[PDB]
Design a protein around this ligand. Structure first.
Ligand SMILES: C[n+]1ccccc1CNC(=O)[C@@H]1CCCN1C(=O)[C@H](N)Cc1ccccc1
Ligand SMILES: *[C@@H]1O[C@H](CO)[C@@H](O)[C@H](O)[C@H]1NC(C)=O
Ligand code: NA
Ligand code: NA
Lengths: 28, 251, 11
């Protein structure tokens, strides 16, 4: 789906969940 | 999930619960990949050593859930199965090689704030993200310890582990269709999937396009959260040609 | 341990 992987309550409204930053920090 | 935390509302809207009709109980996790297709581990449906061989009419899928045991009126949606497809080279005899299955729903599920599909990786995102040290996220309603059960969906973030370390942690033959994840004893932090988390997703958020991709399926481990052991996950990209073949032919 | 689900889904 064109919209896959974009969560209505997070990415769709530009809100971040409490631990996604931990993932980002590991992507070096 | 061992040593995880409560999910936030809508944190994993592709999460699916495979539910046994009789007796009513949690069977496995799974994930929503379109309005009609659900992805899970083959061993959730077929595992002869344990006399497991479910048919479509034996199960339901429950989508949009947060609470493990509650009927989440006006939020979750319950779907019947039209057909199960198990990888034809799924190796239940030895090492769970190619531990992957698809379930086609009888009717499309309506997306909502709580129900939304995850992306499957292409070659490029897999190459970029499937690297030792990079973290993914595992979710499920499985046991909180190896030897109890959660009120709500649990989540844990875990690093992908170097292949030689995965290989050296076990006597089981590892294949290119698997990867392993978890902290090493010297890393302090911990966490793992456990019984009941089987079939659920290992996801990563691409820093290139800010979308979530399902890189793995919870497959196997020796105990749960043991020092020096790691969780093993089906390598979704490696098996994507099969996924696409099934969807193209039966979709 | 699970709350009953609507009968419509068990038919
Ligand atoms: C228990 N566990 C830990 C981490 C992730 C997922 C799981 C759940 N998976 C399982 O319980 C699977 C199903 C069949 C036996 N099994 C296992 O994980 C076995 N403990 C190890 C095994 C692996 C491959 C072939 C035979 C045995
Ligand atoms: C599992 O069940 C099907 C029938 O529903 C049967 O044909 C099959 O032989 C059984 N065992 C397998 C696939 O190992
Ligand atoms: Na080994
Ligand atoms: Na471990």
């Amino acid at each position: 789906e064109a919209d896959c992987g974009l969560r209505p309550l997070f990415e769709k409204k530009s809100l971040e969940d409490k631990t996604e930053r931990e993932l980002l920090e590991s992507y070096i | 999930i061992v040593e995880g935390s409560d999910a936030e509302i809508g944190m994993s809207p592709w999460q699916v619960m495979l539910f046994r009709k009789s007796p009513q109980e949690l069977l496995c996790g799974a994930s929503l990949i379109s309005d009609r297709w659900v992805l899970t581990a083959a061993h959730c449906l077929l595992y002869p050593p344990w006399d497991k061989n479910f048919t479509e009419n034996d199960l339901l899928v429950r989508i949009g859930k947060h609470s493990r045991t509650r009927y989440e009126r006006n939020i979750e949606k319950i779907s019947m199965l039209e057909k199960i497809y198990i990888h034809p080279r799924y190796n239940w005899r030895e090492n769970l090689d190619r531990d992957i299955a698809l379930m086609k729903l009888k009717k499309p599920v309506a997306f909502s704030d709580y129900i939304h599909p995850v992306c499957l990786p292409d070659r490029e995102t897999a190459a970029s993200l499937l690297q030792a040290g990079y973290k993914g996220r595992v979710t499920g309603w499985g046991n909180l310890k190896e030897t109890g059960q959660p009120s709500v969906l649990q989540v844990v973030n875990l690093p992908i582990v170097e292949r030689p370390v995965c290989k050296d942690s076990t006597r089981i033959r590892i294949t290119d269709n698997m990867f392993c994840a978890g902290y090493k004893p010297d890393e302090g932090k911990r966490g793992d999937a456990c019984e009941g988390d089987s079939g659920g997703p290992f996801v990563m958020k691409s820093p290139f396009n800010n979308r979530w991709y399902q890189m793995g399926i919870v497959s196997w481990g020796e105990g749960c959260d043991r020092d020096g052991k790691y969780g093993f996950y089906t390598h979704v990209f490696r098996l994507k040609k099969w996924i696409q073949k099934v969807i193209d032919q039966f979709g | 341990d699970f709350e009953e689900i609507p009968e419509e889904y068990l038919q």
